[PDB]
Amino acid sequence: GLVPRGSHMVVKVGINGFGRIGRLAFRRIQNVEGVEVTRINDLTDPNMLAHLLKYDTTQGRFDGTVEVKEGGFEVNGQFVKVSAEREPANIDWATDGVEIVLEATGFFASKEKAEQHIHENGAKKVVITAPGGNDVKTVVFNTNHDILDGTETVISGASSTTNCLAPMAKALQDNFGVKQGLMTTIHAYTGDQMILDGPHRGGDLRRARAGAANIVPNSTGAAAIGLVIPELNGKLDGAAQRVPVPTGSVTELVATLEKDVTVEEVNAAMKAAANDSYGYTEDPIVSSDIVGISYGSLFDATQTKVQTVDGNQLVKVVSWYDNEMSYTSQLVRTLEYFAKIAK
Amino acid sequence: VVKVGINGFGRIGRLAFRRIQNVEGVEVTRINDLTDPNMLAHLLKYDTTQGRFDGTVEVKEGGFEVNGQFVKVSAEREPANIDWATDGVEIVLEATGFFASKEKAEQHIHENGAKKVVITAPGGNDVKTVVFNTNHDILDGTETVISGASSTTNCLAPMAKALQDNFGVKQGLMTTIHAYTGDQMILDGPHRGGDLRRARAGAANIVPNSTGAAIGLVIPELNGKLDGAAQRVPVPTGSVTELVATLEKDVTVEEVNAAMKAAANDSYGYTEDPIVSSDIVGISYGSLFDATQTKVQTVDGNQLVKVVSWYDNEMSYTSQLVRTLEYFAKIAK
Amino acid sequence: VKVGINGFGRIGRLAFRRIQNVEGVEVTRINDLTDPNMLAHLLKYDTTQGRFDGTVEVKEGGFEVNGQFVKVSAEREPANIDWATDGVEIVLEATGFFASKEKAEQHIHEGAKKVVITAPGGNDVKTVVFNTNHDILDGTETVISGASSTTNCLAPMAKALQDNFGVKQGLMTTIHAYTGDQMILDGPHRGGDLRRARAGAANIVPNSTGAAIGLVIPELNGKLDGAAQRVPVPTGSVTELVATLEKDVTVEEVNAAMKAAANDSYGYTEDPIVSSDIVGISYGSLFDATQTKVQTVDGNQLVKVVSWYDNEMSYTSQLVRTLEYFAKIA
Amino acid sequence: VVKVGINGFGRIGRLAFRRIQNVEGVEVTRINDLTDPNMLAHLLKYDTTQGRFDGTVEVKEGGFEVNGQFVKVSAEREPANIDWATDGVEIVLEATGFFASKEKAEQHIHENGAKKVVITAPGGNDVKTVVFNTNHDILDGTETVISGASSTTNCLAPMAKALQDNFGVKQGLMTTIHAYTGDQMILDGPHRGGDLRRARAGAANIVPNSTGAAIGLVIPELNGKLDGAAQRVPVPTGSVTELVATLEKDVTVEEVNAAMKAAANDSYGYTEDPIVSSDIVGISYGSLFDATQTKVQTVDGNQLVKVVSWYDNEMSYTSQLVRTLEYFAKIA
Ligand SMILES: NC(=O)c1ccc[n+]([C@@H]2O[C@H](COP(=O)([O-])OP(=O)(O)OC[C@H]3O[C@@H](n4cnc5c(N)ncnc54)[C@H](O)[C@@H]3O)[C@@H](O)[C@H]2O)c1
Ligand SMILES: NC(=O)c1ccc[n+]([C@@H]2O[C@H](COP(=O)([O-])OP(=O)(O)OC[C@H]3O[C@@H](n4cnc5c(N)ncnc54)[C@H](O)[C@@H]3O)[C@@H](O)[C@H]2O)c1
Ligand SMILES: NC(=O)c1ccc[n+]([C@@H]2O[C@H](COP(=O)([O-])OP(=O)(O)OC[C@H]3O[C@@H](n4cnc5c(N)ncnc54)[C@H](O)[C@@H]3O)[C@@H](O)[C@H]2O)c1
Ligand SMILES: NC(=O)c1ccc[n+]([C@@H]2O[C@H](COP(=O)([O-])OP(=O)(O)OC[C@H]3O[C@@H](n4cnc5c(N)ncnc54)[C@H](O)[C@@H]3O)[C@@H](O)[C@H]2O)c1
Ligand SMILES: O=C[C@H](O)COP(=O)(O)O
Ligand SMILES: O=C[C@H](O)COP(=O)(O)O
Ligand SMILES: O=C[C@H](O)COP(=O)(O)O
Ligand SMILES: O=C[C@H](O)COP(=O)(O)O
């Protein structure tokens, strides 16, 4: 009973933080009818942002025309306003008809701080492009977007590893039942790592190190999975290994299950679970092959292991994801759906 | 002074040569590869990941001089045709990567050739496989062909044995996040070994792959209880092994770390510093346990235990290789 | 016209890709040193150039591309390749091992009619950079060269200077992506080069360059020389040229001359781009006006001009353009 | 024993600190940055490109100990508010990259502050700019603010002076193929300095850029005769400078190389080995001439001359910086 809007009824979106996720979100929204970006807020001039939209190291040239103007830029003829406001409270989103804001700066990833966007002359709702705490509904599309009714003011689109892990873990649960599991993500380097050894503003002694020249251990925002799959809460934990590729990642999960299984049964379950969000492949691919994909998670049957020792089984399952575009695809899918049921 | 020969003056061969400079009673008198001495002399002097050679290297005819001492160089394809005895060589380091079996490594042993061979890699189940300070007991000195194992094996072995001896291991799964190597392609192209993943550009990709860690040969009681795989990533050297395992006893994170510290020696290191891969380049430990990455997950009375150890696939292995070579040379009967 | 590819490597595979969108050119036979499954996989998936735009399915003795079967063979000697069996008239020699008239001719026997070498092929072989000197071709030739990637970059930029201002002399530096003939890690280089021996994705590596040109622009013969700096990117390059000219010039005049010279082969841009922005482009050379310098000291001028190129796809685009044109003149 | 302070414990600051351990007249008693001592202690111990610290480092309150000796750490944003005198500091190494001018570097000199300042970068035309063993003659010891030049300047200077003194230089154009640096972005993003190229992912691109060596302050006679640019490329340190020039005299390749060998010293190295960038990481030469890359093109009586020298933008510069600091400290 959610009375969703048609794609002909156009919801106007604002992007706070025109960074990797923000710019890629903007790109995908070009091919979503009924969602449209009318306002961008960052910490720089429009020429910088226009240039970064046109040209993209890992994701290729922009599919269209971009021309700089005063106080903004034009994309395929359509003007988009640019502002440079530090404080989310001072952003006059309503001036440009913006109802929903994509919070993509990485600095306001909580209910309290994201709410600052909602005020007079501001926005109605906010989607955080990251984990946003336990008091915020956290959505991985085609896994738990049921939870949305449309009344919510602040929601989270989860992390990129969460979007990778979730469908793979849920497939295990639903078919076999999961007792417990440990996860390792072999992950591309990101903007919060230092280009060369130097003082990390977050106090992390490992993110302080040269990210494109090191294997760097680190924490992960997907262990936060109980918010997406309630029945698995407290049963999964894990960590990351940040490695020298500018984008593209893979999640390994080692787990104990309720029932006995074979490699063939596991792969078959994953193929059966496949959809627009959760992909399936039996090709021996590498990280560059998943750059720019629209799947939130791509299961790799070639890496599946089922070890049996004295009646006991450890099960290993592995799924690829482009931490940039895979997440962004899921983010926009969640945004689109949320916009149509917004109250 | 036992005189050694190196077949395959590659990454492991050149680094083995370097370490042997500081081992009294071991000395390299003959090198065999597929190239001229100028190429090899240059590759010894200058090293991308391991730094400049600590000494003098000057090219001569049919060889080169290292700190005054001449070392002969030959370019023989077939191990059968290498006249090792001419230069007083008794033991050969087989480091080409093309003769890693008993049958093929034996070809070094003939008249005018060598007496013994150490393979710098896994060499099959009919060859004693040694990780130093873990199972070098098995050597009596009568053996003709031995294996020094793989680099991941030298990393995993002491960490796994420490778990076994203290707590007892039921089963375990391993992932090594591993530097790229010479058998990967620099850019996408046909791999001569038929591997569709090693075919891909190794310095521009996360590349899944099999792993040579053959652990039951080193720790017999764990045979068939451990399996694993690799993720090859863009660093020119330096690696880390993660092991997830179930144990016979209940444990805490503190107990696990304490067991590892107690097990520490020249081969097995210990650290509580939050280090990264570049910090282990050139170390002499075969394995360096990292207490900062230890996990002990407890869910409904059941425990999964995660333990992680660093290793420089190049120098860590080479240090272990030379330690094993030194010891084997002294008991050679 | 039915084409054969010898050496299904970086250039061979990318040539194959471009030929899909050239009507009247079609690849019916591939020869390499491996099984079809390896080659089919390498066609589908490409680190730097992206996934294949189509379907690839492995068969016996070959593979299918969008339904069409393409035969695969594994013959080491070009003399033993029975090209005629598959109606092949022209062969793309892309192995890097037969880059001379003598050795490339070995394809022509009872086999193929003609051969295009995907590299410099000596002074006794017509060397073509498309839209610069493809006028040279009459169609009777048995063996031709498509030049090198740096040659295709430099040529239109250097000719534009000559035609407008006249060139006295010049020195060139290409800051170049690493290539397959470099070692992944320090090791013995089969060609004897002590620098290509070194880890190519972890070093700035000085090296020689195959663009030292008089074969493409006769009037500039012996007036240009240069070198390379190989650097850690898997593809994408840039050529810098410092030169003395016959006439006095300004920065504006130079850029204007380059824009006037622009076409399908020679691009023009005033955007401050980087190497990743030129990966996969179809221009053989893309002049960058932002890097132009004209230094004047005591009446004398040094002139600096810079052009981008994807050593892989830029060259391949030029190669296929030259192949298409050469095929049509029987 | 002259007591030194480091403002900005970054790449140059930390490496300067390392080299000062083996300089007897010089000692670091105070470090100022924007972080806690644990972060700085860790970054001193472990170094991606330059290797582990040769010694012992242990964290304390308000500082850390190095081989037993305590060094104080503070976190003051404004150079005016740094009480250098408290720790006996006379000379400050300004290594933040944010105070590279006479005006802004002078802010270190006040009551309870420092006496003198060495900027680890170009610092404008009103500040004596020194490349050691090329023009450190210029120093008399009365100066309040000096510059140690840039890394490319320290590379280029001895190579260019050798050309001038032997053959005479008419004009020249320079290209440095340079390692990426901290002021580039790790991934595509808004550059705080407004540069659209430094905005791009530095470890995944060839990135054109300006250069801080484009030299008349170091070699007066060459002023306005040289200009150039950079190509930033994916290595975490290590660089090479190419110079193409016209000369007053005719020359051969052998004569050029011979002139460079004759000019060699502790600052200016010479080599005939075909080396690559990793081979110069951590060297103490400010500039290392490579004879293998020399070219002398002759066309119709006219000559273009190409000369190339290696440098570790990090340690080569730092070696020169400390040599200049040592000498400057001695003549106060
Ligand atoms: N990159 C990924 O792989 C990835 C994946 C999933 C989620 N995320 C999340 O998305 C968010 C951003 O990630 P990213 O990698 O795109 O970040 P980024 O660093 O690339 O971009 C952040 C942008 O925010 C801007 N910004 C910073 N402070 C601001 C302020 N006060 N006001 C306005 N703008 C400001 C910056 O100028 C920059 O343009 C984070 O929450 C991150 O956790 C990132
Ligand atoms: N590099 C590592 O991380 C590592 C660690 C442990 C073990 N290993 C093992 O050590 C061996 C060598 O590895 P690498 O990376 O040092 O090899 P590499 O590719 O660097 O060197 C192989 C060398 O052997 C030479 N060679 C090849 N065929 C030959 C022949 N028929 N006769 C004489 N010389 C020949 C080559 O010229 C080359 O110098 C392999 O078995 C490998 O599995 C490697
Ligand atoms: N990639 C570039 O940057 C570039 C640009 C312009 C020109 N070229 C030239 O193109 C040629 C190929 O370069 P590449 O980069 O594609 O190299 P590559 O190494 O990727 O391709 C060579 C291919 O030929 C095959 N091959 C080798 N020997 C053979 C034989 N005897 N018979 C049949 N097949 C054989 C190999 O298996 C490999 O797949 C070279 O001449 C090179 O100089 C390269
Ligand atoms: N790295 C090189 O290649 C190189 C070579 C020659 C010269 N330089 C010069 O050295 C200077 C610094 O270079 P870098 O690459 O080491 O920088 P960096 O980014 O490594 O270090 C800068 C340090 O200064 C600190 N800092 C910033 N603002 C500060 C303030 N207000 N007060 C105290 N500390 C502050 C930072 O936290 C950081 O630790 C620049 O002027 C640069 O031109 C660098
Ligand atoms: O920082 C951004 C990451 O891409 C998302 O976090 P994660 O790797 O833990 O999922
Ligand atoms: O060839 C590579 C080294 O021997 C180590 O590889 P590994 O993971 O099989 O031990
Ligand atoms: O063109 C072939 C290789 O890419 C090398 O290029 P180059 O000879 O133009 O320098
Ligand atoms: O940004 C820091 C540079 O290293 C400064 O030195 P440079 O101008 O000589 O390149």
- Cα→Cα distances D2→B103, D24, D71, D91, D331, Å: 68, 9, 15, 8, 11
Domains in chain C with CATH codes = 1-147+312-330 (no CATH), 148-311 (3.30.360.10)
CA-based nearest residue to C9, from C43, C56, C45, C60: C43
B259 Cβ partners below 8 Å, 6+ apart?
A: B162, B163, B166, B167
- Residue ranges around ligand 2 (CB below 6 Å): B 7-13, 32-34, 77, 95-98, 100, 120-121, 150-151, 181-182, 313-314, 317; C 187-188
The helix (run of H) or strand (run of E) holding residue B317 is helix B315-330
In contact, B229 and B208? CB cutoff 8 Å: yes
C326 Cβ partners below 8 Å, 6+ apart?
A: C90, C114, C116, C137, C139, C144
Q: Which residues of B touch C203 (CB under 8 A)?
A: 48
Structure tokens at A277: 């969000």
In contact, D48 and A214? CB cutoff 8 Å: yes
B232 Cβ partners below 8 Å, 6+ apart?
A: B178, B179, B180, B181, B184, B197, B202, B205, B206, B207, B208, B209
CA-based nearest residue to B8, from B56, B102, B74, B89: B74
Q: Which residues of C touch B47 (CB under 8 A)?
A: 186
Using a CB–CB cutoff of 8 Å, tell me whether B186 touches chain D: no
Structure tokens at C248: 């006095």
Amino acid identity of residue C211, one-letter, is: A
Helices (H), D224-279: 253-262
- Cα→Cα distances D232→B97, C288, D47, D198, D238, Å: 37, 16, 21, 9, 11
In contact, C106 and C78? CB cutoff 8 Å: yes
Task: Tell me the HSE value of A53 on the side-chain side, using a 13 A CA sphere.
Answer: 29
Method for structure elucidation? X-ray
Ligand that lies nearest to the alpha carbon of residue D10, given by its number in the listed order: 4
Using a CB–CB cutoff of 8 Å, tell me whether C207 touches chain D: no
Give the DSSP letter of residue A51: H
CA distance C316 to C320: 6
In contact, D30 and D5? CB cutoff 8 Å: yes
CA distance D90 to D1: 11
Task: Tell me the HSE value of D101 on the side-chain side, using a 13 A CA sphere.
Answer: 3
Q: Which residues of A touch D9 (CB under 8 A)?
A: 199
Largest CA distance in chain C: 71
User: How many other β-carbons are positioned within 10 Å of the β-carbon of residue A275?
Assistant: 13
Interface size between A and D, measured as CB pairs under 8 A: 115
For residue D9, which atom of ligand 4 is closest to its CA?
39
Using a CB–CB cutoff of 8 Å, tell me whether A205 touches chain B: yes
As beta bridge partners, residue B94 has B7, B119
Q: Which residues of B touch A184 (CB under 8 A)?
A: 175, 242
Task: Tell me the HSE value of D187 on the side-chain side, using a 13 A CA sphere.
Answer: 19
As beta bridge partners, residue D177 has D231, D240
- Is B279 within 8 Å of D49 when comparing Cβ atoms? no
Chain C residue at shortest CA distance from A48: C272
- Rg (C-alpha) for chain D, rounded Å, is 20
Considering only CA atoms, which residue is closest to atom 42 of ligand 1?
A106
Backbone angles phi, psi at A168, to 5 degrees: -70, -45
- Is C236 within 8 Å of D204 when comparing Cβ atoms? no
DSSP string computed for B231-290: EEES-SS-EEEEEEEEESS---HHHHHHHHHHT-SSSEEEE-S---GGGGTT-S-SEEEE
CB-nearest to A55 from C41, C47, C273 is: C273
C67 Cα: distance to centroid of ligand 4 (angstroms): 59
Backbone angles phi, psi at D269, to 5 degrees: -85, 165
CA-based nearest residue to C256, from C302, C213, C294: C294
CA-based nearest residue to D277, from D237, D218, D307, D316: D237
Q: Which residues of D touch B271 (CB under 8 A)?
A: none
D280 Cβ partners below 8 Å, 6+ apart?
A: D238, D288, D310, D311, D312, D316
Sheet (strand B116-119) strand order: B57-60, B63-66, B69-74, B26-32, B2-7, B91-94, B116-119, B145-147
Query: Chains that contact D by 3+ CB pairs under 8 Å?
Result: A, B, C
D205 Cα: distance to centroid of ligand 1 (angstroms): 21
The helix (run of H) or strand (run of E) holding residue C171 is strand C167-177
User: How many other β-carbons are positioned within 10 Å of the β-carbon of residue A106?
Assistant: 16
The bridge status of strand C167-177 relative to strand C237-245 is antiparallel
- Is D188 within 8 Å of A45 when comparing Cβ atoms? no
Counting ligand 2 atoms within 8 A of each CB, the residue from B32, B34, B92, B183 with the most, and so the one to mutate, is B34
CA distance B273 to A209: 14
B61 Cβ partners below 8 Å, 6+ apart?
A: none
User: How many other β-carbons are positioned within 10 Å of the β-carbon of residue C249?
Assistant: 17
Numbers of helices and strands, H then E, in chain B: 6, 16
Helix axes C251-260, C149-165, angle to 10 degrees: 120
CA distance A334 to B85: 73
Tokens 């054109």 found at: D208
- Rg (C-alpha) for chain C, rounded Å, is 20
- Residue ranges around ligand 7 (CB below 6 Å): C 148-151, 174, 176, 179, 209-211, 228, 311
A279 Cα: distance to centroid of ligand 1 (angstroms): 26
The bridge status of strand C167-177 relative to strand C224-231 is parallel
CA distance B28 to B18: 10
Sheet (strand D91-94) strand order: D57-60, D63-66, D69-74, D26-32, D2-7, D91-94, D116-119, D145-147
D100 Cα: distance to centroid of ligand 8 (angstroms): 13
CA distance A234 to A226: 7
Counting ligand 7 atoms within 8 A of each CB, the residue from C150, C229, C307 with the most, and so the one to mutate, is C150
3-state percent helix, strand, coil for chain B, nearest multiple of 5 = 25, 30, 45
Ligand that lies nearest to the alpha carbon of residue C72, given by its number in the listed order: 3
Instruction: Output the CA angle B94-B99-B103, nearest 5 degrees.
Output: 110
Backbone angles phi, psi at B102, to 5 degrees: -60, -55
- Rg (C-alpha) for chain B, rounded Å, is 20
DSSP string computed for C43-102: HH--TTT-S-SS-EEEETTEEEETTEEEEEE--SSGGG--GGGGT--EEEE-SSS--SHH
DSSP string computed for D288-325: EEEGGG-EEEEETTEEEEEEEEEE-TTHHHHHHHHHHH
Instruction: Output the CA angle C231-C47-C60, nearest 5 degrees.
Output: 135
CA distance B1 to A83: 76
In contact, C206 and B57? CB cutoff 8 Å: no
CA-based nearest residue to C249, from C150, C165, C312, C148: C165
CA of A296 to nearest chain D CA: how many angstroms apart?
Answer: 21
Chain D residue at shortest CA distance from A43: D190
Exposure string (b/e) for C17-50, b if CB count within 10 Å is 16 or more? bbbbeeeebebbbbbbebebebbbbbbbbbbbbb
- Is B186 within 8 Å of C183 when comparing Cβ atoms? yes
The helix (run of H) or strand (run of E) holding residue B156 is helix B151-167
Structure tokens at B198: 């090693």
Residue C201 CA, chain-centre distance (Å), reads 21
Structure tokens at D185: 């972005």
Using a CB–CB cutoff of 8 Å, tell me whether D188 touches chain A: yes
- Cα→Cα distances B323→B158, B332, C122, Å: 15, 14, 53
Chain B residue at shortest CA distance from D41: B273
Structure tokens at A276: 């627009």
CA-based nearest residue to B161, from B182, B139, B183, B135: B135
In contact, D296 and D251? CB cutoff 8 Å: yes
Q: Does the CA dihedral D140-D145-D148-D153 come out positive or negative?
A: negative
Backbone angles phi, psi at C305, to 5 degrees: -135, 140
In contact, B55 and B21? CB cutoff 8 Å: yes
DSSP string computed for C253-298: HHHHHHHHT-SSSEEEE-S---GGGGTT-S-SEEEEGGG-EEEEET
Exposure string (b/e) for D263-286, b if CB count within 10 Å is 16 or more? bbeebbbbbeebbbbbbbbbbbbb
The bridge status of strand C224-231 relative to strand C205-207 is antiparallel
Tokens 């013994």 found at: B116
Structure tokens at B134: 């873990």
B69 Cβ partners below 8 Å, 6+ apart?
A: none
Chain C residue at shortest CA distance from A60: C277
Using a CB–CB cutoff of 8 Å, tell me whether A206 touches chain B: yes
For residue B121, which atom of ligand 6 is closest to its CA?
4
CA-based nearest residue to B92, from B66, B59, B115, B61: B115
Residue A120 CA, chain-centre distance (Å), reads 29
